[PDB]
RNA sequence: AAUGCUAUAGUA
């Protein structure tokens, strides 16, 4: 997406010659893909575009009558929040074909948000929106969320991101250290010293 | 004011 961003990414690719630099470019490309998907979903769903807002900020957003200092909320950053009919929905954007990666997120959010739900007495429902990049389709974890919007239709294809990722892999396919780094998260360790 | 991965005689 975008032409200036595409040019900046291409300039970053050409000068890149180290495994850590390539890993950083890959991480930023995945983050940009997530940003594209989140912005498009926010535009389609007619809700404000937010990303990783603090939970306590949401608490003061929905009910600005309780003291923020006294309340104790989990430090996770929800991608988005939606308040309707005395129910708060925690929205998390995911761009993967793996249901397991998002059910892990669902369980962690549920076990964390149950304390806040008892303390405030608002039932906190967690929804994870999942899109498969290879074939555009939308999967919703929460039945209530899909009930709120009878149809879920976005028109997005990640052809730009896939081609640049393929170019990056082609440049650094020989680099074994790069292949090790992309396997795990942002925390990178080199080859073992023994 | 500032923002680029390699930024690379003295003190105990």
UniProtKB/Swiss-Prot annotation:
This is RNA-directed RNA polymerase L. Residues 1-185 are annotated as: Endonuclease. Mn(2+) 1 binds at residues 34, 79, 92-93. It is found in: Host Golgi apparatus; Host endoplasmic reticulum; Host endoplasmic reticulum-Golgi intermediate compartment; Virion. It comes from Bunyavirus La Crosse. Belongs to the Bunyavirales RNA polymerase family. It comes from the Viruses. Mn(2+) 2 binds at residues 52, 79. RNA-dependent RNA polymerase, which is responsible for the replication and transcription of the viral RNA genome using antigenomic RNA as an intermediate. During transcription, synthesizes subgenomic RNAs and assures their capping by a cap-snatching mechanism, which involves the endonuclease activity cleaving the host capped pre-mRNAs. These short capped RNAs are then used as primers for viral transcription. The 3'-end of subgenomic mRNAs molecules are not polyadenylated. During replication, the polymerase binds the 5' and 3' vRNA extremities at distinct sites. The N-terminus contains the endonuclease activity (endoN). The central region contains the RdRp activity. The C-terminus contains the cap-binding region. Homomultimer. Interacts with the glycoprotein N; this interaction allows efficient polymerase packaging into virus particles. Interacts with nucleoprotein N. The chain holds residues 1 to 194 of 2263 of the full protein. Changing residue 92 to A: Complete loss of nuclease activity. Classified as His(+) endonuclease since it has a histidine upstream of the active site that coordinates the first cation. Changing residue 94 to A: Complete loss of nuclease activity.
């Amino acid at each position: 997406m975008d032409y200036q961003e595409y040019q900046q990414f291409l300039a970053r690719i050409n000068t890149a010659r180290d495994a850590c630099v390539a890993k950083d470019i890959d991480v930023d490309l995945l983050m940009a893909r997530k940003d594209y998907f989140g912005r498009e979903l926010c535009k389609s769903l007619n809700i404000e575009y937010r990303n990783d807002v603090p939970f306590i900020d949401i608490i003061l957003d929905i009910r600005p009558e309780v003291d923020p200092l006294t309340i104790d909320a989990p430090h996770i950053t929800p991608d988005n929040y939606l308040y309707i009919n005395n129910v708060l929905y925690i929205i998390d954007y995911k761009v993967s074909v793996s249901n397991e990666s998002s059910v892990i997120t669902y369980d962690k959010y549920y076990e964390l948000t149950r304390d806040i739900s008892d303390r405030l007495s608002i039932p906190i429902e967690i929804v994870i929106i999942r899109i498969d990049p290879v074939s555009r389709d939308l999967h919703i974890n929460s039945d209530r969320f899909k009930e709120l919007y009878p149809t879920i239709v976005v028109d997005i294809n990640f052809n730009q991101f896939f081609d640049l990722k393929q170019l990056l892999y082609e440049k650094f396919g020989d680099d074994e250290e790069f292949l090790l780094k992309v396997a795990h998260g942002d925390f990178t360790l080199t080859a073992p010293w023994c």
